[PDB]
Amino acid sequence: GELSEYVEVNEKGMPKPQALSLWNMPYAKRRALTKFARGVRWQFIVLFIALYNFKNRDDSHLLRRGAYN
Amino acid sequence: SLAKVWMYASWIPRGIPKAMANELSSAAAALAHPEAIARVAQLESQGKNPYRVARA
Amino acid sequence: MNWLYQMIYYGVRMWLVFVLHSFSLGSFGELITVITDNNLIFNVFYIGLLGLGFI
Amino acid sequence: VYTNWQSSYTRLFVSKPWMWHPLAWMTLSVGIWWKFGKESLCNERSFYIHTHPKWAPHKFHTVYNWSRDPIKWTLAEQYASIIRNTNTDIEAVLKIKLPANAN
Amino acid sequence: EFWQMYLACWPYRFRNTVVEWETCKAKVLKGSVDLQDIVDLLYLLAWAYLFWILGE
Amino acid sequence: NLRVEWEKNMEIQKKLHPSGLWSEEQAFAAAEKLGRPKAGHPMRVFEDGYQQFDLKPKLFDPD
Amino acid sequence: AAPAEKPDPALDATKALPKALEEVEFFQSYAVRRKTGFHLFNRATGSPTIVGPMFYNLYNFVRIGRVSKYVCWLSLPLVFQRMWMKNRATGMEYDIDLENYAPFEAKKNPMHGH
Amino acid sequence: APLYPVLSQASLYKRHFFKNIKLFHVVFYVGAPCVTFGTAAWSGSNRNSREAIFMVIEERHGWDNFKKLSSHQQGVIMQEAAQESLLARNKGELHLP
Amino acid sequence: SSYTGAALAPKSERLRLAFEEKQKDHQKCIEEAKGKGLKKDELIDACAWTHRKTILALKDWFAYRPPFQDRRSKWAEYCSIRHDSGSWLGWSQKFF
Numbered sequence: 001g002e003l004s005e006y007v008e009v010n011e012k013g014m015p016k017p018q019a020l021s022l023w024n025m026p027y028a029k030r031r032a033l034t035k036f037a038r039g040v041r042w043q044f045i046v047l048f049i050a051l052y053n054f055k056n057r058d059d060s061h062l063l064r065r066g067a068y069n
Numbered sequence: 070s071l072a073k074v075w076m077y078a079s080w081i082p083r084g085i086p087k088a089m090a091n092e093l094s095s096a097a098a099a100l101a102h103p104e105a106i107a108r109v110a111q112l113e114s115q116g117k118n119p120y121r122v123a124r125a
Numbered sequence: 126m127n128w129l130y131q132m133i134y135y136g137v138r139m140w141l142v143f144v145l146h147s148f149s150l151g152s153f154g155e156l157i158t159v160i161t162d163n164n165l166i167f168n169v170f171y172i173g174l175l176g177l178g179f180i
Numbered sequence: 181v182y183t184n185w186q187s188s189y190t191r192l193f194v195s196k197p198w199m200w201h202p203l204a205w206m207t208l209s210v211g212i213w214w215k216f217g218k219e220s221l222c223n224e225r226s227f228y229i230h231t232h233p234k235w236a237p238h239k240f241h242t243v244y245n246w247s248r249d250p251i252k253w254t255l256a257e258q259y260a261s262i263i264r265n266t267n268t269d270i271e272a273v274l275k276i277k278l279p280a281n282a283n
Numbered sequence: 284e285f286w287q288m289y290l291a292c293w294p295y296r297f298r299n300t301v302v303e304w305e306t307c308k309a310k311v312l313k314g315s316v317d318l319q320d321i322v323d324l325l326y327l328l329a330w331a332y333l334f335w336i337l338g339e
Numbered sequence: 340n341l342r343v344e345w346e347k348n349m350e351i352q353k354k355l356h357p358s359g360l361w362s363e364e365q366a367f368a369a370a371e372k373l374g375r376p377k378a379g380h381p382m383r384v385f386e387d388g389y390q391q392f393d394l395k396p397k398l399f400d401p402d
Numbered sequence: 403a404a405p406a407e408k409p410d411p412a413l414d415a416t417k418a419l420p421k422a423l424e425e426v427e428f429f430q431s432y433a434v435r436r437k438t439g440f441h442l443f444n445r446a447t448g449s450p451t452i453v454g455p456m457f458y459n460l461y462n463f464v465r466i467g468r469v470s471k472y473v474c475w476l477s478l479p480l481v482f483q484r485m486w487m488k489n490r491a492t493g494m495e496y497d498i499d500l501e502n503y504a505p506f507e508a509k510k511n512p513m514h515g516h
Numbered sequence: 517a518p519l520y521p522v523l524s525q526a527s528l529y530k531r532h533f534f535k536n537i538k539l540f541h542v543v544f545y546v547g548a549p550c551v552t553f554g555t556a557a558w559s560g561s562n563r564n565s566r567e568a569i570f571m572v573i574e575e576r577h578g579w580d581n582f583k584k585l586s587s588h589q590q591g592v593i594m595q596e597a598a599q600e601s602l603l604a605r606n607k608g609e610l611h612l613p
Numbered sequence: 614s615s616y617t618g619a620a621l622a623p624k625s626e627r628l629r630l631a632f633e634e635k636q637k638d639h640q641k642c643i644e645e646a647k648g649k650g651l652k653k654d655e656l657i658d659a660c661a662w663t664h665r666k667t668i669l670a671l672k673d674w675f676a677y678r679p680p681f682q683d684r685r686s687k688w689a690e691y692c693s694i695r696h697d698s699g700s701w702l703g704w705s706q707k708f709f
């Protein structure tokens with residue numbers, strides 16, 4: 001089994017742990033971790049790559065025109 | 070012995086035509102009419118060469 | 126997507142199989158013909174007319 | 181007794197996806213050629229790649245004969261036929277002086 | 284008829300090649316070689332020389 | 340053996356091209372002898388649509 | 403989910419190998435031959451060959467054909483054509499100038515491209 | 517009193533000749549001429565020896581001059597070219613790339 | 614050595630120089646055909662190749678419009694990205 005975006009539930013309405021249990025920590029810590037998490041992983045990686053390439057973008061075509069003189 | 074040496078020396082020469090020879094023999098046994106084969110056996114029993122007889 | 130991957134993979138596999146096996150077989154045949162053409166004692170139907178072909 | 185098998189090919193085609201499959205196959209193959217193989221291989225600007233020994237080995241049963249250049253003279257005959265049908269002046273193109281996108 | 288006998292005669296010929304070879308060997312070693320044997324061997328050598336030229 | 344010996348003896352003294360290789364000097368001399376055109380380089384790599392699928396193309400440069 | 407289907411014998415594999423062996427047995431049944439006119443050159447050891455004793459079957463099947471047994475031999479003269487032309491070419495005398503100017507399938511000929 | 521266009525016995529006898537074919541009756545009967553006179557044996561040998569022959573000719577003699585010669589000398593040079601190609605002295609006598 | 618970088622001349626200048634080169638290659642064919650003493654109908658069969666090459670270079674030059682200056686193109690230049698300032702939808706404008 002171990003399907004994607006799938007999770008089983010026990011009698012208490014709680015998710016059963018497939019690999020790792022993280023329901024021992026208090027609600028405050030979980031809310032701190034998950035308040036900023038989303039249902040998206042690779043888009044943030046592509047965005048960080050784009051931001052790195054934007055910080056490191058080339059501006060020679062502006063140098064040729066004289067915008068840095 | 071010397072006979073074994075001659076065998077292992079003449080194996081490769083002796084066996085080059087054996088395939089075609091066996092092929093022709095078997096194709097004769099198959100395609101040829103059995104009456105002709107029986108006549109060949111008869112003539113060979115009579116001491117004659119049936120190939121020369123056929124040619125004649 | 127893995128359906129597409131498997132389709133491409135097995136198409137390429139069949140192509141490679143046919144091409145490479147035909148080429149290898151023909152290459153061995155041509156090498157044998159080179160060995161026998163230079164040695165006409167062997168340039169004979171040494172296995173047989175139908176035996177090799179049937180096999 | 182009525183059957184589309186013997187009385188209507190259209191309703192038979194509509195009622196059977198396994199009759200739609202070959203048509204979709206055909207359309208997809210032609211679209212693939214149109215998008216990818218058309219301009220890269222079949223266009224006159226992209227037809228000399230058939231002379232390449234790596235990407236088109238023995239498309240002419242041999243290595244391409246460049247001293248002969250069959251492509252050049254075939255297409256030149258055809259362009260000449262176009263020019264004669266259109267009655268265009270050969271030397272009119274040489275009287276042109278294109279400007280430059282200054283600044 | 285000749286085609287059928289030509290086919291049917293191939294086994295006889297391939298069988299008697301070895302027989303004639305062994306008898307020739309025995310006659311040459313024993314020395315019991317006669318006039319008809321000499322004539323047959325000369326005919327043999329003539330045809331063999333012709334086929335030697337042909338193979339050349 | 341006769342053929343290959345003659346061919347080797349001619350390859351050694353440069354009267355014949357080596358096995359599998361087109362030699363320039365012998366070909367030019369044979370062209371001068373037969374009065375034929377010399378072997379040129381008729382290919383055109385910079386023709387439209389020849390090295391488009393080439394990852395490492397060749398650059399045009401008037402020498 | 404829990405359909406409880408009984409085993410289907412048609413989905414088993416207990417007939418393919420028997421059927422193939424039946425076909426092979428039908429093939430080998432045509433290898434039966436009479437003692438008269440039998441000859442097979444064995445190896446120098448005296449042991450039989452492989453292809454030798456399985457030529458009668460093949461040619462007994464060739465006997466039963468209708469078109470191939472009269473057509474498939476017409477490609478065989480071509481073998482002797484090659485046998486003869488190869489020997490003609492092994493020692494053919496040629497002009498040195500044309501071989502140096504126009505060598506056949508030689509490498510580094512710019513007129514070819516490389 | 518059949519209301520349909522009853523087909524004669526002889527017409528069925530003739531159609532049976534056409535629809536009583538088996539697979540092998542097509543496969544082998546059409547494969548024998550095909551395998552013999554096909555891209556493998558005869559047509560292939562002919563049409564692929566021609567390419568090498570005329571390559572050799574146009575490299576050595578020229579196609580126009582070859583066209584100007586007689587059919588006999590044409591055949592002579594063609595046979596010489598066929599021998600040169602079958603030999604493949606430059607490929608180490610091997611018809612491989 | 615070598616380097617993967619920007620084109621030397623602009624697209625407009627590149628196409629212009631290509632057309633001029635094909636103009637030269639066509640003029641040479643025409644002058645040679647005139648030296649050989651060919652008529653118009655023979656000159657066509659001679660230099661139709663270079664004529665078509667010149668015409669294709671001219672087509673390339675005419676098809677390419679150099680870009681117009683505006684705020685979006687300048688912002689893309691600052692961002693150093695290939696951007697069309699005539700599209701409200703991007704890749705989907707092809708279908709709308």
Ligand SMILES: CCCCCCCCCCCCO[C@@H]1O[C@H](CO)[C@@H](O[C@H]2O[C@H](CO)[C@@H](O)[C@H](O)[C@H]2O)[C@H](O)[C@H]1O
Nearest residue numbers: 052053054055056057058059060061062063068691693
């Ligand atoms: C926890 C503290 C850690 C301390 C270490 C911090 C290190 C942070 C990384 C600094 C590295 C900056 O890396 C450097 O960035 C500059 C821009 O900033 C890039 O430069 C880029 O921007 C310039 C600015 O116009 C362009 O002209 C240029 O063409 C382009 O390459 C360099 O190619 C890269 O080498």
Ligand SMILES: COCCOCCOCCOc1ccc(C(C)(C)CC(C)(C)C)cc1
Nearest residue numbers: 314315316317318319320321322323325326
């Ligand atoms: C073209 O034909 C020329 C034939 O030449 C034959 C030469 O003569 C050879 C005769 O040699 C022999 C050998 C043996 C014998 C013996 C001793 C065995 C006697 C015999 C034949 C009466 C049994 C006789 C003659």
Ligand SMILES: COCCOCCOCCOc1ccc(C(C)(C)CC(C)(C)C)cc1
Nearest residue numbers: 327328329330331332333334335336337339
């Ligand atoms: C098994 O042995 C059978 C007989 O073998 C005898 C071999 O004799 C050697 C003959 O040598 C030659 C070689 C060539 C020739 C030529 C080329 C002169 C013959 C010719 C002109 C008829 C072709 C003649 C004799």
Ligand SMILES: COCCOCCOCCOc1ccc(C(C)(C)CC(C)(C)C)cc1
Nearest residue numbers: 417418419420421422423424425426538539
């Ligand atoms: C190791 O390989 C084992 C794989 O086994 C393959 C089994 O397939 C056998 C197929 O061969 C045939 C062909 C025809 C037939 C019959 C006789 C049933 C054909 C028919 C219907 C014309 C009578 C039966 C078996």
Ligand SMILES: COCCOCCOCCOc1ccc(C(C)(C)CC(C)(C)C)cc1
Nearest residue numbers: 422425426429430433434455456457459460
């Ligand atoms: C469609 O499936 C049929 C394919 O079957 C092909 C079988 O090919 C093998 C037949 O070849 C042989 C092998 C051995 C034999 C005989 C030599 C059985 C052995 C014998 C006669 C000495 C007992 C005959 C023919």
Ligand SMILES: COCCOCCOCCOc1ccc(C(C)(C)CC(C)(C)C)cc1
Nearest residue numbers: 468469524525526527528529530531532533
């Ligand atoms: C290799 O073969 C190529 C040519 O073969 C031609 C075979 O033609 C045979 C035609 O078969 C017949 C024979 C008779 C008939 C008729 C109608 C005359 C028979 C009849 C009168 C009994 C109904 C019809 C078809």
Ligand SMILES: COCCOCCOCCOc1ccc(C(C)(C)CC(C)(C)C)cc1
Nearest residue numbers: 179422425537538539540541542543544547
């Ligand atoms: C190892 O197997 C080798 C044998 O393969 C030979 C390939 O033969 C090609 C097709 O041969 C046929 C011909 C007819 C048939 C039958 C007789 C079953 C055809 C049918 C179903 C129409 C009666 C089956 C196969």
